[PDB]
Amino acid sequence: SQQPFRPRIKAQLSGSGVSGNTDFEANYDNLEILSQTIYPDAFGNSLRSKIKAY
Amino acid sequence: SQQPFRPRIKAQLSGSGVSGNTDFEANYDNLEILSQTIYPDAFGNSLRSKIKAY
């Protein structure tokens, strides 16, 4: 559809978790999603011919 | 149905009745009845574990 496209990547998961008998809720991790927006451009060229006879 | 319960007891007659051919209405006796109401109450305890691997 040549609409502006948007690709997404999943960032790698980092950050220290939880040690020992500690609740998962003491250090949540963040699922991080990055994106890009690709917009189209229009471009062109043209040749103008001379009189048919020539 | 664990609704607040009500037990009842019947007391003892203590009136002097009628003696000769005197009739019952001359001294009526009183059937006296007593009661108590028992309400419920909720209590409880709990234990929270460690991590399953521990």
mmCIF file of N, CA and C in Angstrom:
data_model
loop_
_atom_site.group_PDB
_atom_site.id
_atom_site.type_symbol
_atom_site.label_atom_id
_atom_site.label_comp_id
_atom_site.label_asym_id
_atom_site.label_seq_id
_atom_site.Cartn_x
_atom_site.Cartn_y
_atom_site.Cartn_z
ATOM 1 N N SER A 1 0.814 -1.206 0.000
ATOM 2 C CA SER A 1 0.000 0.000 0.000
ATOM 3 C C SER A 1 0.851 1.259 0.000
ATOM 4 N N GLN A 2 2.175 1.128 0.022
ATOM 5 C CA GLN A 2 3.095 2.257 0.042
ATOM 6 C C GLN A 2 2.758 3.256 1.138
ATOM 7 N N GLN A 3 2.052 2.811 2.169
ATOM 8 C CA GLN A 3 1.904 3.627 3.350
ATOM 9 C C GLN A 3 3.227 3.648 4.098
ATOM 10 N N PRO A 4 3.468 4.674 4.883
ATOM 11 C CA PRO A 4 4.657 4.675 5.738
ATOM 12 C C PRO A 4 4.753 3.413 6.580
ATOM 13 N N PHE A 5 5.842 2.677 6.411
ATOM 14 C CA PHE A 5 6.049 1.422 7.109
ATOM 15 C C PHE A 5 6.733 1.668 8.441
ATOM 16 N N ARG A 6 6.555 0.726 9.362
ATOM 17 C CA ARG A 6 7.164 0.825 10.684
ATOM 18 C C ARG A 6 7.681 -0.533 11.139
ATOM 19 N N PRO A 7 8.969 -0.803 10.952
ATOM 20 C CA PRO A 7 9.555 -2.020 11.509
ATOM 21 C C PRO A 7 9.954 -1.835 12.964
ATOM 22 N N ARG A 8 9.907 -2.946 13.697
ATOM 23 C CA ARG A 8 10.156 -2.969 15.131
ATOM 24 C C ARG A 8 11.189 -4.034 15.463
ATOM 25 N N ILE A 9 12.079 -3.713 16.395
ATOM 26 C CA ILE A 9 13.038 -4.668 16.935
ATOM 27 C C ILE A 9 12.825 -4.796 18.437
ATOM 28 N N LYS A 10 13.161 -5.968 18.964
ATOM 29 C CA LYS A 10 13.106 -6.213 20.399
ATOM 30 C C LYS A 10 14.491 -6.022 20.995
ATOM 31 N N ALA A 11 14.624 -5.046 21.885
ATOM 32 C CA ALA A 11 15.898 -4.801 22.536
ATOM 33 C C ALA A 11 16.275 -5.984 23.412
ATOM 34 N N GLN A 12 17.576 -6.177 23.598
ATOM 35 C CA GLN A 12 18.014 -7.273 24.442
ATOM 36 C C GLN A 12 17.738 -6.962 25.902
ATOM 37 N N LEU A 13 17.463 -8.014 26.650
ATOM 38 C CA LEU A 13 17.035 -7.893 28.026
ATOM 39 C C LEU A 13 18.266 -7.876 28.922
ATOM 40 N N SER A 14 18.361 -6.870 29.781
ATOM 41 C CA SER A 14 19.520 -6.701 30.641
ATOM 42 C C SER A 14 19.022 -6.382 32.043
ATOM 43 N N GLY A 15 19.921 -5.926 32.899
ATOM 44 C CA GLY A 15 19.516 -5.604 34.247
ATOM 45 C C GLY A 15 19.518 -6.811 35.158
ATOM 46 N N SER A 16 20.012 -6.624 36.376
ATOM 47 C CA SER A 16 20.118 -7.720 37.323
ATOM 48 C C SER A 16 18.744 -8.187 37.763
ATOM 49 N N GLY A 17 18.582 -9.497 37.863
ATOM 50 C CA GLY A 17 17.303 -10.037 38.254
ATOM 51 C C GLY A 17 17.127 -9.983 39.751
ATOM 52 N N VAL A 18 16.726 -11.095 40.346
ATOM 53 C CA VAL A 18 16.593 -11.198 41.789
ATOM 54 C C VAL A 18 17.450 -12.354 42.277
ATOM 55 N N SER A 19 18.056 -12.181 43.443
ATOM 56 C CA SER A 19 18.951 -13.171 44.019
ATOM 57 C C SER A 19 18.253 -13.930 45.135
ATOM 58 N N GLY A 20 18.453 -15.243 45.160
ATOM 59 C CA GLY A 20 17.992 -16.033 46.285
ATOM 60 C C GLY A 20 16.487 -16.024 46.407
ATOM 61 N N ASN A 21 16.009 -15.931 47.642
ATOM 62 C CA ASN A 21 14.579 -16.017 47.927
ATOM 63 C C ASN A 21 13.907 -14.655 47.858
ATOM 64 N N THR A 22 14.141 -13.929 46.777
ATOM 65 C CA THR A 22 13.568 -12.609 46.590
ATOM 66 C C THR A 22 12.474 -12.691 45.543
ATOM 67 N N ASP A 23 11.423 -11.908 45.742
ATOM 68 C CA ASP A 23 10.286 -11.941 44.841
ATOM 69 C C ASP A 23 10.674 -11.412 43.471
ATOM 70 N N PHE A 24 10.166 -12.075 42.429
ATOM 71 C CA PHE A 24 10.320 -11.571 41.070
ATOM 72 C C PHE A 24 9.958 -10.098 40.985
ATOM 73 N N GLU A 25 9.016 -9.656 41.819
ATOM 74 C CA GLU A 25 8.523 -8.289 41.823
ATOM 75 C C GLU A 25 9.491 -7.299 42.442
ATOM 76 N N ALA A 26 10.616 -7.755 42.980
ATOM 77 C CA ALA A 26 11.589 -6.826 43.532
ATOM 78 C C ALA A 26 12.452 -6.188 42.458
ATOM 79 N N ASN A 27 12.589 -6.832 41.302
ATOM 80 C CA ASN A 27 13.302 -6.245 40.170
ATOM 81 C C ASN A 27 12.643 -6.785 38.904
ATOM 82 N N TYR A 28 11.661 -6.048 38.407
ATOM 83 C CA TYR A 28 11.072 -6.362 37.120
ATOM 84 C C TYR A 28 12.017 -5.927 36.016
ATOM 85 N N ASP A 29 11.990 -6.657 34.917
ATOM 86 C CA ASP A 29 12.689 -6.219 33.724
ATOM 87 C C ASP A 29 11.705 -5.539 32.785
ATOM 88 N N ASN A 30 12.252 -4.800 31.830
ATOM 89 C CA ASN A 30 11.455 -4.020 30.894
ATOM 90 C C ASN A 30 11.651 -4.596 29.503
ATOM 91 N N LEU A 31 10.597 -5.177 28.946
ATOM 92 C CA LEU A 31 10.610 -5.555 27.539
ATOM 93 C C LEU A 31 10.600 -4.283 26.707
ATOM 94 N N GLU A 32 11.684 -4.026 25.991
ATOM 95 C CA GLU A 32 11.855 -2.775 25.269
ATOM 96 C C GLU A 32 11.736 -3.009 23.773
ATOM 97 N N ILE A 33 10.840 -2.253 23.136
ATOM 98 C CA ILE A 33 10.617 -2.374 21.666
ATOM 99 C C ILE A 33 11.001 -1.054 20.993
ATOM 100 N N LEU A 34 11.868 -1.124 19.981
ATOM 101 C CA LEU A 34 12.263 0.033 19.207
ATOM 102 C C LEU A 34 11.607 -0.062 17.842
ATOM 103 N N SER A 35 11.444 1.088 17.197
ATOM 104 C CA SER A 35 10.780 1.133 15.906
ATOM 105 C C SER A 35 11.419 2.198 15.036
ATOM 106 N N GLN A 36 11.164 2.076 13.739
ATOM 107 C CA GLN A 36 11.565 3.082 12.771
ATOM 108 C C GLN A 36 10.390 3.360 11.850
ATOM 109 N N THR A 37 10.308 4.582 11.338
ATOM 110 C CA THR A 37 9.258 4.938 10.393
ATOM 111 C C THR A 37 9.892 5.260 9.046
ATOM 112 N N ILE A 38 9.561 4.469 8.034
ATOM 113 C CA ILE A 38 10.054 4.662 6.676
ATOM 114 C C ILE A 38 8.927 5.239 5.835
ATOM 115 N N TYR A 39 9.112 6.467 5.373
ATOM 116 C CA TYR A 39 8.287 7.314 4.529
ATOM 117 C C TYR A 39 8.756 7.257 3.080
ATOM 118 N N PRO A 40 7.847 7.241 2.113
ATOM 119 C CA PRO A 40 8.268 7.235 0.710
ATOM 120 C C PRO A 40 8.622 8.621 0.198
ATOM 121 N N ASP A 41 9.491 8.638 -0.809
ATOM 122 C CA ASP A 41 9.757 9.818 -1.618
ATOM 123 C C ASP A 41 9.405 9.532 -3.068
ATOM 124 N N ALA A 42 9.034 10.582 -3.791
ATOM 125 C CA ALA A 42 8.720 10.491 -5.208
ATOM 126 C C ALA A 42 9.741 11.286 -6.004
ATOM 127 N N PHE A 43 10.272 10.676 -7.056
ATOM 128 C CA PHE A 43 11.274 11.340 -7.876
ATOM 129 C C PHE A 43 11.154 10.837 -9.304
ATOM 130 N N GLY A 44 11.593 11.658 -10.248
ATOM 131 C CA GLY A 44 11.446 11.266 -11.635
ATOM 132 C C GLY A 44 12.248 12.156 -12.551
ATOM 133 N N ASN A 45 12.204 11.802 -13.831
ATOM 134 C CA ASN A 45 12.928 12.506 -14.876
ATOM 135 C C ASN A 45 12.101 12.475 -16.148
ATOM 136 N N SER A 46 12.510 13.272 -17.131
ATOM 137 C CA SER A 46 11.719 13.401 -18.343
ATOM 138 C C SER A 46 12.577 13.938 -19.477
ATOM 139 N N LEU A 47 12.334 13.412 -20.672
ATOM 140 C CA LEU A 47 12.978 13.844 -21.901
ATOM 141 C C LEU A 47 11.928 14.420 -22.836
ATOM 142 N N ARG A 48 12.194 15.615 -23.348
ATOM 143 C CA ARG A 48 11.340 16.278 -24.323
ATOM 144 C C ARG A 48 11.985 16.158 -25.696
ATOM 145 N N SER A 49 11.321 15.419 -26.587
ATOM 146 C CA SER A 49 11.838 15.183 -27.959
ATOM 147 C C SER A 49 11.638 16.428 -28.828
ATOM 148 N N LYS A 50 12.355 16.498 -29.952
ATOM 149 C CA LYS A 50 12.220 17.644 -30.889
ATOM 150 C C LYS A 50 11.092 17.346 -31.883
ATOM 151 N N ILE A 51 10.807 18.293 -32.782
ATOM 152 C CA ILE A 51 9.717 18.120 -33.788
ATOM 153 C C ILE A 51 9.905 16.797 -34.537
ATOM 154 N N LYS A 52 8.808 16.046 -34.694
ATOM 155 C CA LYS A 52 8.749 14.718 -35.370
ATOM 156 C C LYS A 52 9.630 14.688 -36.626
ATOM 157 N N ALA A 53 9.453 15.657 -37.529
ATOM 158 C CA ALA A 53 10.245 15.763 -38.776
ATOM 159 C C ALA A 53 11.741 15.578 -38.486
ATOM 160 N N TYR A 54 12.293 16.335 -37.532
ATOM 161 C CA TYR A 54 13.714 16.232 -37.228
ATOM 162 C C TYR A 54 14.043 14.873 -36.631
ATOM 163 N N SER B 1 -27.476 -23.399 57.814
ATOM 164 C CA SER B 1 -27.053 -22.080 57.367
ATOM 165 C C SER B 1 -26.500 -21.335 58.571
ATOM 166 N N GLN B 2 -25.222 -20.968 58.520
ATOM 167 C CA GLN B 2 -24.552 -20.524 59.735
ATOM 168 C C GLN B 2 -25.035 -19.144 60.149
ATOM 169 N N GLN B 3 -26.309 -19.017 60.372
ATOM 170 C CA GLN B 3 -26.870 -17.773 60.848
ATOM 171 C C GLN B 3 -26.772 -17.707 62.360
ATOM 172 N N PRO B 4 -26.749 -16.510 62.925
ATOM 173 C CA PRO B 4 -26.767 -16.382 64.385
ATOM 174 C C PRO B 4 -27.884 -17.190 65.020
ATOM 175 N N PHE B 5 -27.508 -18.157 65.846
ATOM 176 C CA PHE B 5 -28.434 -19.128 66.405
ATOM 177 C C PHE B 5 -29.063 -18.582 67.677
ATOM 178 N N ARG B 6 -30.216 -19.135 68.045
ATOM 179 C CA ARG B 6 -30.917 -18.715 69.257
ATOM 180 C C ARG B 6 -31.470 -19.919 70.014
ATOM 181 N N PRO B 7 -30.788 -20.369 71.065
ATOM 182 C CA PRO B 7 -31.359 -21.378 71.961
ATOM 183 C C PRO B 7 -32.225 -20.788 73.065
ATOM 184 N N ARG B 8 -33.172 -21.604 73.531
ATOM 185 C CA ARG B 8 -34.171 -21.180 74.504
ATOM 186 C C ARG B 8 -34.353 -22.248 75.575
ATOM 187 N N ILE B 9 -34.578 -21.800 76.805
ATOM 188 C CA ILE B 9 -34.866 -22.686 77.927
ATOM 189 C C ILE B 9 -36.221 -22.330 78.517
ATOM 190 N N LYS B 10 -36.854 -23.318 79.135
ATOM 191 C CA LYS B 10 -38.138 -23.149 79.801
ATOM 192 C C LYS B 10 -37.919 -23.198 81.307
ATOM 193 N N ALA B 11 -38.306 -22.134 81.998
ATOM 194 C CA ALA B 11 -38.125 -22.055 83.441
ATOM 195 C C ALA B 11 -39.141 -22.960 84.138
ATOM 196 N N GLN B 12 -39.207 -22.856 85.458
ATOM 197 C CA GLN B 12 -40.007 -23.753 86.271
ATOM 198 C C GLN B 12 -41.194 -23.005 86.857
ATOM 199 N N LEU B 13 -42.337 -23.677 86.917
ATOM 200 C CA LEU B 13 -43.518 -23.061 87.497
ATOM 201 C C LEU B 13 -43.365 -22.953 89.006
ATOM 202 N N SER B 14 -43.886 -21.870 89.569
ATOM 203 C CA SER B 14 -43.731 -21.628 90.995
ATOM 204 C C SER B 14 -44.986 -21.066 91.645
ATOM 205 N N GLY B 15 -46.117 -21.059 90.956
ATOM 206 C CA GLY B 15 -47.316 -20.475 91.501
ATOM 207 C C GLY B 15 -48.117 -21.452 92.337
ATOM 208 N N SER B 16 -48.789 -20.915 93.347
ATOM 209 C CA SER B 16 -49.805 -21.670 94.057
ATOM 210 C C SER B 16 -51.079 -21.666 93.231
ATOM 211 N N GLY B 17 -51.627 -22.842 92.976
ATOM 212 C CA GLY B 17 -52.728 -22.922 92.045
ATOM 213 C C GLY B 17 -54.059 -22.614 92.687
ATOM 214 N N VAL B 18 -55.016 -23.523 92.549
ATOM 215 C CA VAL B 18 -56.346 -23.361 93.113
ATOM 216 C C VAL B 18 -56.606 -24.513 94.072
ATOM 217 N N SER B 19 -57.328 -24.231 95.158
ATOM 218 C CA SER B 19 -57.441 -25.177 96.264
ATOM 219 C C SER B 19 -58.701 -26.036 96.204
ATOM 220 N N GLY B 20 -59.872 -25.433 96.333
ATOM 221 C CA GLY B 20 -61.064 -26.239 96.510
ATOM 222 C C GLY B 20 -61.708 -26.602 95.195
ATOM 223 N N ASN B 21 -62.941 -26.156 94.992
ATOM 224 C CA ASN B 21 -63.511 -26.117 93.658
ATOM 225 C C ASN B 21 -63.339 -24.746 93.023
ATOM 226 N N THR B 22 -62.557 -23.873 93.656
ATOM 227 C CA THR B 22 -62.062 -22.666 93.014
ATOM 228 C C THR B 22 -61.535 -23.003 91.630
ATOM 229 N N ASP B 23 -61.869 -22.185 90.643
ATOM 230 C CA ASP B 23 -61.497 -22.586 89.299
ATOM 231 C C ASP B 23 -60.204 -21.918 88.855
ATOM 232 N N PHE B 24 -59.666 -22.452 87.761
ATOM 233 C CA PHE B 24 -58.303 -22.166 87.342
ATOM 234 C C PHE B 24 -58.052 -20.675 87.176
ATOM 235 N N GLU B 25 -59.032 -19.935 86.657
ATOM 236 C CA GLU B 25 -58.830 -18.515 86.397
ATOM 237 C C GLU B 25 -58.510 -17.720 87.650
ATOM 238 N N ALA B 26 -58.821 -18.247 88.832
ATOM 239 C CA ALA B 26 -58.545 -17.504 90.053
ATOM 240 C C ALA B 26 -57.055 -17.287 90.255
ATOM 241 N N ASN B 27 -56.224 -18.212 89.784
ATOM 242 C CA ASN B 27 -54.774 -18.042 89.871
ATOM 243 C C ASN B 27 -54.155 -18.742 88.661
ATOM 244 N N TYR B 28 -53.920 -17.974 87.605
ATOM 245 C CA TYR B 28 -53.238 -18.505 86.440
ATOM 246 C C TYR B 28 -51.742 -18.561 86.701
ATOM 247 N N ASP B 29 -51.087 -19.536 86.091
ATOM 248 C CA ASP B 29 -49.641 -19.638 86.165
ATOM 249 C C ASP B 29 -49.008 -19.101 84.888
ATOM 250 N N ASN B 30 -47.719 -18.793 84.977
ATOM 251 C CA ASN B 30 -46.993 -18.106 83.916
ATOM 252 C C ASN B 30 -45.864 -18.991 83.415
ATOM 253 N N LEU B 31 -45.978 -19.441 82.171
ATOM 254 C CA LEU B 31 -44.929 -20.217 81.518
ATOM 255 C C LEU B 31 -43.855 -19.250 81.044
ATOM 256 N N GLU B 32 -42.775 -19.147 81.803
ATOM 257 C CA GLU B 32 -41.709 -18.206 81.505
ATOM 258 C C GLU B 32 -40.608 -18.889 80.707
ATOM 259 N N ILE B 33 -40.166 -18.221 79.631
ATOM 260 C CA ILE B 33 -39.154 -18.780 78.680
ATOM 261 C C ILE B 33 -37.998 -17.790 78.489
ATOM 262 N N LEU B 34 -36.764 -18.299 78.532
ATOM 263 C CA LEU B 34 -35.557 -17.501 78.418
ATOM 264 C C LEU B 34 -34.799 -17.891 77.161
ATOM 265 N N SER B 35 -33.884 -17.024 76.751
ATOM 266 C CA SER B 35 -33.275 -17.181 75.443
ATOM 267 C C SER B 35 -31.862 -16.619 75.460
ATOM 268 N N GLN B 36 -31.066 -17.076 74.504
ATOM 269 C CA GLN B 36 -29.745 -16.521 74.261
ATOM 270 C C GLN B 36 -29.485 -16.553 72.767
ATOM 271 N N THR B 37 -28.679 -15.614 72.282
ATOM 272 C CA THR B 37 -28.327 -15.559 70.870
ATOM 273 C C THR B 37 -26.817 -15.647 70.697
ATOM 274 N N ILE B 38 -26.386 -16.553 69.825
ATOM 275 C CA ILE B 38 -24.980 -16.854 69.592
ATOM 276 C C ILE B 38 -24.634 -16.434 68.173
ATOM 277 N N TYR B 39 -23.740 -15.505 68.054
ATOM 278 C CA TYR B 39 -23.235 -14.968 66.805
ATOM 279 C C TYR B 39 -21.929 -15.646 66.414
ATOM 280 N N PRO B 40 -21.663 -15.798 65.123
ATOM 281 C CA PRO B 40 -20.405 -16.407 64.690
ATOM 282 C C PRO B 40 -19.266 -15.397 64.655
ATOM 283 N N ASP B 41 -18.074 -15.923 64.402
ATOM 284 C CA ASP B 41 -16.865 -15.122 64.307
ATOM 285 C C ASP B 41 -15.864 -15.884 63.460
ATOM 286 N N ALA B 42 -15.084 -15.158 62.671
ATOM 287 C CA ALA B 42 -14.161 -15.762 61.726
ATOM 288 C C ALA B 42 -12.724 -15.457 62.119
ATOM 289 N N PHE B 43 -11.876 -16.474 62.035
ATOM 290 C CA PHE B 43 -10.461 -16.312 62.338
ATOM 291 C C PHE B 43 -9.670 -17.254 61.449
ATOM 292 N N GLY B 44 -8.377 -16.999 61.339
ATOM 293 C CA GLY B 44 -7.552 -17.840 60.497
ATOM 294 C C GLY B 44 -6.103 -17.432 60.580
ATOM 295 N N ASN B 45 -5.269 -18.256 59.954
ATOM 296 C CA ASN B 45 -3.818 -18.117 59.975
ATOM 297 C C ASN B 45 -3.267 -18.534 58.621
ATOM 298 N N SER B 46 -1.980 -18.279 58.398
ATOM 299 C CA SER B 46 -1.418 -18.542 57.080
ATOM 300 C C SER B 46 0.096 -18.650 57.153
ATOM 301 N N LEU B 47 0.655 -19.415 56.219
ATOM 302 C CA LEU B 47 2.092 -19.579 56.052
ATOM 303 C C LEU B 47 2.458 -19.370 54.592
ATOM 304 N N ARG B 48 3.438 -18.508 54.351
ATOM 305 C CA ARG B 48 3.948 -18.229 53.017
ATOM 306 C C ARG B 48 5.318 -18.870 52.861
ATOM 307 N N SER B 49 5.492 -19.631 51.775
ATOM 308 C CA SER B 49 6.729 -20.431 51.582
ATOM 309 C C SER B 49 7.900 -19.650 51.011
ATOM 310 N N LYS B 50 8.982 -20.382 50.739
ATOM 311 C CA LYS B 50 10.171 -19.775 50.104
ATOM 312 C C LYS B 50 10.049 -20.048 48.604
ATOM 313 N N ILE B 51 11.129 -19.859 47.850
ATOM 314 C CA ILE B 51 11.093 -20.197 46.403
ATOM 315 C C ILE B 51 11.080 -21.717 46.321
ATOM 316 N N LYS B 52 10.464 -22.248 45.279
ATOM 317 C CA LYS B 52 10.287 -23.693 45.170
ATOM 318 C C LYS B 52 11.618 -24.436 45.155
ATOM 319 N N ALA B 53 12.640 -23.860 44.525
ATOM 320 C CA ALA B 53 13.923 -24.546 44.471
ATOM 321 C C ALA B 53 14.578 -24.611 45.842
ATOM 322 N N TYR B 54 14.392 -23.585 46.670
ATOM 323 C CA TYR B 54 14.837 -23.665 48.056
ATOM 324 C C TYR B 54 14.082 -24.746 48.814
#
